[PDB]
Paper text:
[name] has a minimal baseplate of only six protein components, and it possesses a much simpler tail fiber composed of only one protein gp24, providing an ideal model for synthetic engineering and biotechnological applications. Here, using a minimal myocyanophage, termed [name], isolated from Lake Chaohu, we demonstrate that the chaperone gp25 forms a stable complex with the tail fiber gp24 at a stoichiometry of 3:3. Each gp24 subunit consists of three domains: the N-terminal α-helical domain required for docking to the baseplate, the tumor necrosis factor (TNF)-like and glycine-rich domains responsible for recognizing the host receptor. Each gp25 subunit consists of two domains: a non-conserved N-terminal β-sandwich domain that binds to the TNF-like and glycine-rich domains of the fiber, and a C-terminal α-helical domain that mediates trimerization/assembly of the fiber.
To gain structural insights into gp25-assisted assembly of gp24 trimer, we determined the cryo-EM structure of the gp24-gp25 complex at 3.1 Å resolution. The residues from Leu31 to Pro280 of gp24 were modeled to the final structure. By contrast, the structure of the full-length gp25 (residues Met1~Phe162) was solved. In the gp24-gp25 complex, the gp24 trimer adopts an extended structure, whereas three separated β-sandwich domains of gp25 trimer embrace the distal moieties of gp24 trimer at the center, forming an elongated complex structure of ~140 Å in length. Seeing along the three-fold axis, the gp25 trimer covers the distal loops of gp24, making these loops inaccessible to the solvent. These loops located at the distal of tail fiber were proposed to recognize the host; thus, the chaperone gp25 should be released prior to the maturation of viral particles. Compared to the loose contact within the pairwise TNF-like domain and glycine-rich domain, extensive hydrophobic interactions in the N-terminal α-helical bundle contribute the majority to the trimerization of gp24. Each loop has two glycine-rich motifs (GRMs) that adopt an elongated conformation. These loops run parallel to the fiber axis and stack together into a four-layer lattice at an interval distance of ~5 Å (calculated from Cα atoms) between adjacent GRMs. By contrast, the three β-sandwich domains are separated from each other, which individually protrude outwards like three “tentacles” to stick onto the junction between C-terminal TNF-like and glycine-rich domains of gp24 trimer. The β-sandwich domain of one gp25 subunit interacts with the surface-exposed regions at the lateral of the TNF-like and glycine-rich domains of one gp24 subunit, forming an interface area of ~550 Å2.
Author numbering:
A (entry chain C), C (entry chain B), D (entry chain A): 31 to 280
B (entry chain a), E (entry chain b), F (entry chain c): 1 to 162
The structure:
């Protein structure tokens, strides 16, 4: 054993061990002797920063120490329901947005590929018998959950036909949930999504217009009883959920 | 720095529009094939794609058959609304049994009911004719109370009694 | 290099390295040379103790080594549906309970803030045309998922009105799932929750009364056909799901 | 202190510290001084290999280093809906498949217990009024999510009866999602599942037969209007989702 | 130690009750604003909140209009249940075209069915009048077979033949 | 090596079949209690389990009551399909008012429509009788145009006018 070799070995050991301590952002105390099991609780249980993105377009700031995102879940926008004229036929509810989730996706430190969430389908309630708007698509890291299609305008005594829900495109996610398709109209319920549930139409003569419960849901379409003119519920925009381990604040 | 206005064209139809900063890479964000193309800010959802041009949405087709169907259906359930199905059955039984006997032997109330049914059918036929002769006017004023004229007091009397 | 300085340094290193070994509860073997890669497989993949709480009120025992709870998911109770009288109109199904889930929530070692799960809405089946009870709310760590409101009793030839689902209150969770609202009654389907699906009414003359499938669901409400007296299905209580890393038994 | 005692101590220290380096599969660089925080990112956030199994029967290859599977989620197959005759009554949609998910399940290195996913219930559309097939059950590690029962065939002026959804059997999962039961038929919607949503019937005279949206869903059952002969949508097969930490490729 | 019986008052109305040990902290569990207040054990779900008093649920409103609507709807579909719509159409066409010819030339079965329709109308009118004269009694015994008297043998005969 | 064909028998009924390699352990895969038993390849879904034997699915029960119900329902909505409810009411009111006056004073169109309704009721009665007398034939050819004979020109004319 060389006089310098063992010194180099112990220096390497002491530089290896502590790098974890500030790896998760802790002081190199020489008395505690545990240090959160060497920052291990903080690096596995703690530091699990979760970010919810709802802006229509923006750049996610990835911290320097982050190299892999895990459990990126996204949901496309939802489509509004169709309007109902002053007749008897029901309106077709808009289809809910699709969604996907991925795991262990790799991201370089620095700025992120810009997320874009899908805006909710606005109600085309400016006139009777108008098909509602279609919700926008949600795209991130080359994977897109397309927004659900809108409802369908309905004339007298002719109920509309069902509309397609969302889909998934781009790099294939490990798991994808196609969005609930909007219904033909007699049931009229709007389609659900990953984070939402199929909402039903509300029978009223004032156009109460119950929207979809949560993100990605589709409007339940309009209805007409006793001269009612309910335009149909509005959809809900999609969100992006990401999780990563980092000592920095989210 | 300016924001591009992209639109996702499917089968010559715009189904979704977005406004994104120009520095983005559409391929690196939406995957290999996306269908997003640059469009002028005037482009809205539900627009034609004819050549290198975003044509506006074509106007809805005007169907005379749809007009007639709506006119008839609007006046279809109205007969069952003003007079219920059970009330219709009551009136029909009354008139049938009253006609089953000789007019001389008919009771005064039977004759009154027969007359009331006479003006009732006259009003119904007038309403039907006016509704049918409305496609050329497309249900515009004179409409409503003019499409459906006020029934006589006999009509409301028979509606109330049966 | 002092004669005692290097001795202290190596003592610190050898006391640092093993603290992980019993940190996840393993023997300090000096022959294995791996020791679960420093107990890492054991306290990252293993030790993931999951606890499901269903008692109406109790104190969750937090192990001493536990300092951070991750993925606390809670669902409020569901509400039963209204009864149906011997007429022709339809009862309104009860609304499903809301829910939420949180990540990286901090908890001091010792006892926990008492969880209280929401009891399922009991059926108000004592007679015809009575609205069912509303499910209880589920509260933990300052966050509450309110129970869905009960159904509505129905009279003859007049269908009831829809009822609101649950909501979320307290400290804002990262992901909140508003409960599926109960329907006006012609569809009559009961509201769903995070873990439940929207259940539909069962047409029968004996009152089979199919309840909500799983936790947080809402009863599908009663119905009448051929002189039937279906009271409407009962709701389902909510549960609390927590996960944490600990060498101790759950 | 013995002359060989400290040498043995430092040898043990260096062995313990560098075992982790190839624990995540990295070279023992003497210059990095961090080794990706001892590769603990790649050992907790990285190496999170997710496997989706859809084959009807096969052996999951468990890598040598894997000893603990976490978050094994399975969904049983869905049942197709019943056909509709050319009368007036409605068919009953098939019941959705159940599902479950377990955490921290222990698996010995080597081969795995053969997963078997449930094939989707094929449509018994060879004739009118025939009940659809029932989807298969999904079994793994002693836990089974039974497939939802099929729909019911319908004759003239007599709507069918609802069918039970899937269940869960074997070793009790700590979270189980009973499948959405197929409906009696007037609504007709097929039951949903963990990853699917209740899909509705589509009014058409061509038998478009909209199937369930995603895995575990049940067919929306046949329908009949204007002499139509819609047999009812087909169900969707179930999948198994597993996750584990391993330096090897999935 | 005792257990408090809290209730969540919303708009002066109790929507949920719980029983928790008194050592808990409502703020630390339900968050900053909860609406939970201590209530006596007698308090149930769905209770009025007048002042610092827990009033019991008010009795349901008695609507005579609802009584009449239920009475009529109960007797509304009964005419279509005892006699189907197709049977109704059969009887109406038969009686109408039988009345279209002179009573002298009417076949003996035509007179028989005319009479049978006469007692059928009498029975229907009696049932309707009795149903009207029931709001003051609120559908209590005499009820049912007394609200709906047994139709004559002619009624069942015409129901069976058509 | 061969593949065992297992079936999950519930209450003597096969509800699900699988084909798995024989080296598997059913207990170690499906849990402690499964209900899976070895079955021959000919066994299909929906089969009886009579003792140690897989009986084929029993044939569906033949209900004459169901046959009659289907025959009537098929011919039930047909009257409303050929002649709508509004057209039915129109013809009924017209015939009731025409019969209300003496046959001598009846306008020529009044006797024309009376005769037309006569053939209409004859056709309807014939169709109903033929439909009723079909359970012994179970709706086989002669069927359809023979079950529902072509209505006369008077029928289509009265459908056209109202």
């Amino acid at each position: 054993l060389d006089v310098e070799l063992d010194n180099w070995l112990m220096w390497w050991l002491t530089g290896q061990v502590d790098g974890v301590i500030e790896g998760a952002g802790l002081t190199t105390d020489d008395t505690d002797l545990a240090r959160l099991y060497k920052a291990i609780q903080s690096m596995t249980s703690g530091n699990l920063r979760t970010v919810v993105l709802t802006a229509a377009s923006g750049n996610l700031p990835i911290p320097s120490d982050v190299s892999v995102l895990n459990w990126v879940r996204a949901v496309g926008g939802g489509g509004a329901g169709g309007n109902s004229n002053t007749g008897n036929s029901k309106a077709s509810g808009g289809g809910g947005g699709a969604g996907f989730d991925r795991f262990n996706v790799a991201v370089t430190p620095g700025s992120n590929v810009p997320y874009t969430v899908g805006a909710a389908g606005a109600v085309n309630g400016l006139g009777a018998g108008y098909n509602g708007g279609a919700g926008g698509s949600t795209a991130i890291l080359g994977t897109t959950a397309g927004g659900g299609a809108g409802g369908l305008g309905v004339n007298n005594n002719a109920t509309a036909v069902q509309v397609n829900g969302g889909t998934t495109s781009g790099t294939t996610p490990e798991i994808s949930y196609p969005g609930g398709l909007g219904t033909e109209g007699i049931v009229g319920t709007g389609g659900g999504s990953v984070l939402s549930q199929p909402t039903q139409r509300a029978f009223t003569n004032a156009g109460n217009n119950n929207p979809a419960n949560s993100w990605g849901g589709g409007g339940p379409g309009g209805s007409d009883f006793g001269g009612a003119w309910q335009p149909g519920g509005v959809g809900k925009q999609g969100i992006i959920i990401v999780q990563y381990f980092s000592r920095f604040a989210p | 720095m300016t924001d591009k206005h992209y639109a996702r064209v499917v089968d010559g139809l715009v189904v979704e529009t977005k406004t994104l900063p120009a520095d983005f890479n559409l391929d690196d964000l939406f995957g290999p094939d996306h269908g997003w193309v640059e469009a002028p800010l005037e482009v809205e959802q539900g627009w034609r794609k004819v050549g290198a041009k975003f044509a506006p949405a074509p106007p809805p087709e005007r169907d005379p058959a749809s007009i007639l169907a709506g006119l008839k259906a609007e006046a279809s359930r109205h007969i069952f609304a003003t007079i219920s199905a059970t009330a219709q059955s009551n009136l029909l039984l009354a008139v049938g049994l009253a006609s089953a006997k000789a007019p001389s032997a008919r009771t005064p109330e039977e004759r009154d009911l027969l007359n009331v049914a006479d003006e009732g059918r006259a009003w119904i036929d007038a309403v039907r004719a006016r509704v049918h002769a409305l496609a050329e006017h497309d249900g515009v004023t004179p409409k409503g109370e003019d499409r459906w004229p006020a029934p006589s007091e006999a009509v409301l009397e028979m509606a109330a009694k049966f």
